[PDB]
Structures are given as structure tokens and as C-alpha cells.
Amino acid sequence: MEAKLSSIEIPVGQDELSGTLLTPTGMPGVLFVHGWGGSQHHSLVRAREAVGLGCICMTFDLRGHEGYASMRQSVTRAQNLDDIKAAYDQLASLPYVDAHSIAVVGLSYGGYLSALLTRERPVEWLALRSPALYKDAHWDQPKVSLNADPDLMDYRRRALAPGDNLALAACAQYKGDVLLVEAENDVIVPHPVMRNYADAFTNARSLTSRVIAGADHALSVKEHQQEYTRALIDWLTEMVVGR
Amino acid sequence: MEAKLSSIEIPVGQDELSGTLLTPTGMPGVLFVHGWGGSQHHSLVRAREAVGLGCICMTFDLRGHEGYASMRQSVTRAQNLDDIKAAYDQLASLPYVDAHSIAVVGLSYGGYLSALLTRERPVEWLALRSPALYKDAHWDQPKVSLNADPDLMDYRRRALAPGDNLALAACAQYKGDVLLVEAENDVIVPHPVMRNYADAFTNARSLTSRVIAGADHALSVKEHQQEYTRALIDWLTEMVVGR
Ligand SMILES: [Cl-]
């Protein structure tokens, strides 16, 4: 772990002593991207535990949510991807964070967009929980319009190669380490989406994959909600401990 | 390990997103006090390794040294104790440091004064390397005048109770955890000083004590210089890990 030496002046009487403050720097940074209908607050318990590992963390409200709940029906994936890029840039650009060591931790919609993020920004470690899949068609349409299409159900129950889908393509290019967490009984992002993701990541340094037994997409049982916290934190510990 | 949640604004286009930055806070702080003829720089290798444990560290030039080399012949223990208090206050008062968790790490003269420090400021952990002893007589005299007295040799080879010496008294009151490191063949601060210190600390939560085999007061052999680094860092790890 690295230190920053900052010269300082210590007053004592008519005089001032010279000194050095050593503080942490070049720390790994973790970015949490929430799913649709979520908020910056769902991740704080995990963000906290990550700070425990010696990280700097950031959560934020995607547009179309919270302070921009007003955009729920108009916001495009284009715009939400711009949000993730903005958060990323602000986290990477902090002096005490090492831009070469950013983890992104994305959920459902957030997970999809995070997958995409990696083709445009450096992500050392990528952790996806129940990432959504959508058709490449209609990038600049309202994201709610994507779930309007009843055929979405079928699409997430189909087999899909990297060639069929921009997110899956991004994974095929992805070279970092990957954590894939799924909810055994998810009916929103069911196993076949996961199967497609796992299959597409055949260039990552590593691919870890936890399934939470009997969970649903919300991880609505407390114990599942905590299995995931433990899964994520064990992985970050292993990933970030390594360095 | 504790986190500070700081709300932030993330710009993206005409809009600004709300977010939270989580950063470390309430960290333990370590203060290094150098010996006579030393400087803030002797400790940086250790300060560094301490930042590695999740600390904030500080080293500084005692008056009569460096930028105040001019005061070498006049500076009193009074004034050097004021310096240590000043450094301490500046370290404790940092927002990301927990004032209830400050380690002081003092060498020879610095060690003596650090012992004294504990009777006037809260020190959770106190690590003394070859701490000097001087007669209580003449507080406001030039510290160089103390070594002028040829009888100093004898005094550091005598047995001394807490009642005979203000520093030793401070230890008797000390309740934190204590690390005592000695150089086996030190002729400046020889074993009997150490014996007096060890004996006087019979109220500390704990008393660890390493002797560096065959070392001299300067730890002039590289390997001894590193035994001490390892000794100090193992102890801090155990002390500060504990919490
Ligand atoms: Cl579900």
C-alpha cells in the first residue's frame, strides 16, 4: 500500500517546525452502478465494507431516478452510459485513487451498461450482479420502451453470441477479472442471460461465478442480500489484496 | 475500518447528478519523535510501512535540529516537549484521524520526552527505542548541558524507581500498550536504563520487549536497522489490527 509524503509546518510559539505527513494514496477505487428503479443508497453497506479493504468508493443516482425521477420515461441508454462515464471520470481523477485500479460493480440495467463501460474506460475488475440484456436496436430510445417490447422475455431466454449483442461483444473484448453473481430463481434476469455472459467472457484474466441459492432478482431475503455482500467482498479482497 | 460519506455532484451535460464518495476516516495516527542529532527523515521508511497498515503518520524536526540547527546549544527539554505536543495536536486534530488512537514512536532523547508526553496527552500505544534518561534537575537548562555532566554515565548505569525520575514516574502512570526495543551492545543507553523503564511500566495494558542482538545505539548494521522495522511494524499490526 502506497503513501503520500506532504511537507507541513507545525507551529509552536514564535517558531514553526518543519514536518512530513504521510497519508494513503494510489488506492483502488470502486464504482457502484444501480439497477433500474434503484438509487445510490442500495450499495452503501457494501461501499462501506469496501472502504474497509482500503478503497475509495462512489455511488450515485442514475438519471431518470431520484433528483431526476422526472426523466424516468425519457432517459436513453446513451444518457445513462454518459452518467457512468461521468462518475467513473470523477472517481479516477481523484489524487488518492489509482486510475489504473478501478472496480466497477453493476446491477441489472446498471450491469449491462457497466459491461459496455469497459469498451470505453479502463476497468481492472468488473463485478456484475444479474446484468440485464436488451436488443442493440434503438440506442436513443427511452429505456422504458425496451421493456415495452413483449419479446424481451424471449430474448433473455435465448442463447446469444457476442456477435448478436453489443454488451456481450464488450465482454469478449474484456481482459480484466470478472465476478458474476446470479439469483437462482430470478424471473427478470434468468439463467440464460447469465449463461450468455459467462460464455462471452472468454478473454478475462479470470471468471468467478457465485449463484445465490433460491434468491430472487431483488435478493429480497435478508440472508441472500448478505450472501452477495460476502461474495463481493471476498472477491474484492482477493482481487485487491493481490496488489 | 470506518468510512466517511460525502455527498458530491457529478456533472454530465446540462445536468448534475447526486452521489456519495466513501473515504477512510477515524484512522489511527502514528507520531515519530527522533533522537538528538537526528531528523524527521530517519523514520520515513517506517512511517511508510505504517501507512501500509492503514495509518496516518507524521515525522518532524525537533528544534535545535535542521531548520533550527541554530538552537542546538540553547534548546531546553521544555521547548522540545512543546514541539512534541505541537506535532501531536496537529496530528490528532486531523479529521480523518481518531484522536483516541495515536501511537507515539520515540528514539533516545525523543523516547524520554515521549514517555513524558503521555502524562499530558492521550497515547494509546507507546513504542520506545533505547529511550534516554536524564536527571530531573535543571528542566530549563540547555539539553546539551545535561550531557556536559560527566555523572550522566553513572546515572544511566544505576537502578532508579519511578520516584527518582519524572520520566519513570510517567510510565508508572501509563496505561496504554508499550513496546520497548533495545540494542544489545548500546553504550549510550545501556541495559540498566531499559531495566528501569521496563520495571516502571507496571500499569500498561501490555509490555512487549525486543532486544536486537549485537546492535549498537545507531543500529548501524543494516540487518539490525531492519530487525527494528520488523519489530515495530509487527507490534503496530498487532496493536492496531486488534481494532
Ligand atoms: Cl425474481
Ligand SMILES: [Cl-]
Ligand atoms: Cl552504542
